[PDB]
Amino acid sequence: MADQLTEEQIAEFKEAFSLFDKDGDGTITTKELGTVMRSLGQNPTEAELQDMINEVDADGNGTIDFPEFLTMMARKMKDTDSEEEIREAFRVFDKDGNGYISAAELRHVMTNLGEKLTDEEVDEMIREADIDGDGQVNYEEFVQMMTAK
Amino acid sequence: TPQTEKKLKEYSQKAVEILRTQNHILTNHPNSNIYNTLSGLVEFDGYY
Amino acid sequence: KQFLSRRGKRTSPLDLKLGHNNWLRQVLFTPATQAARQAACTIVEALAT
User: Fold this and answer.
1) Cα dihedral sign for A31, A114, C15, A6?
2) Its family (chain C)?
């Protein structure tokens, strides 16, 4: 799955990993895992970091080696998000599973995020997210929204 | 010495350039404020 | 939110990317006074949390 990555990128990933290796065993700790790819020019968030360590460190040891580091890296430079990821985001937005993201579900997901907005603003963003004129966001609308550049 | 116009312009340009550079040196000197204030209050010989 | 700012009227936040020439270098190395340098050092230290 990592064959799409050119050899120089693997070489520079190895350089970064080795420089970030502490005890010389080719294995690092997850506390500095953010700094490793954070030093390569890409900028993640804390939720990004926690999710990345969750996906790989299933055993909970907190220690990363090279092949699985390449596994993590190979899914970062992709620009077109995988349709599974978009559909999963749709499902998270669609709490009731009815396929239509109403305003109230948006309010719930935004309040859980800790962010606050007025009713008018969320209605405004919903109506600018609508193309069919029904004021309701569906899967095709979400897909064409995330593909807009 | 009687001299041509171009030489006169060169000479005047050199003089004015030196004067301007020294003025710029004086007005941005790190110790310029201290010396300028001390000049009118105390009597001193050199810049210590 | 990014798309809304791109098409609608919401303001677009700036990106955390700093210029390499600024007033900061001027203040940090001024030889006119030392308190200016120390205050600039305190400010930039506080800016990095």
Assistant:
1) positive
2) Belongs to the UBR4 family.
Task: Give CA torsion, residues A102, A107, A109, A113, to 10 deg.
Answer: 160
Specify the DSSP element, H or E, that contains C40.
helix C35-46
Looking at this protein, which amino acid is placed at residue A112?
N
Given in angstroms, what resolution was this structure solved at? 3.1
A43 in a known ligand binding site? no
CA distance C2 to A128: 13
Q: Which residues of A116-137 are buried (b: 16+ CB within 10 A; e: fewer)?
A: eeeeeeeebbbeebeeeeeebb
Contacts of A124 in chain C (CB under 8 A): 8
First to last CA, chain A: 27
Q: DSSP characters for A83-145?
A: HHHHHHHHHHH-TTSSS-B-HHHHHHHHHHTT----HHHHHHHHHHT-SSSSS-B-HHHHHHH
Which experimental approach was used here? Answer: cryo-EM
Chains near A (3 or more Cβ pairs under 8 Å): C
Largest interatomic CA distance in chain C: 49
Of A43, A124, A145, the CB nearest to C3: A145
Looking at the complex, does the CB of residue C46 fall below 8 Å from at least one CB of chain B? no
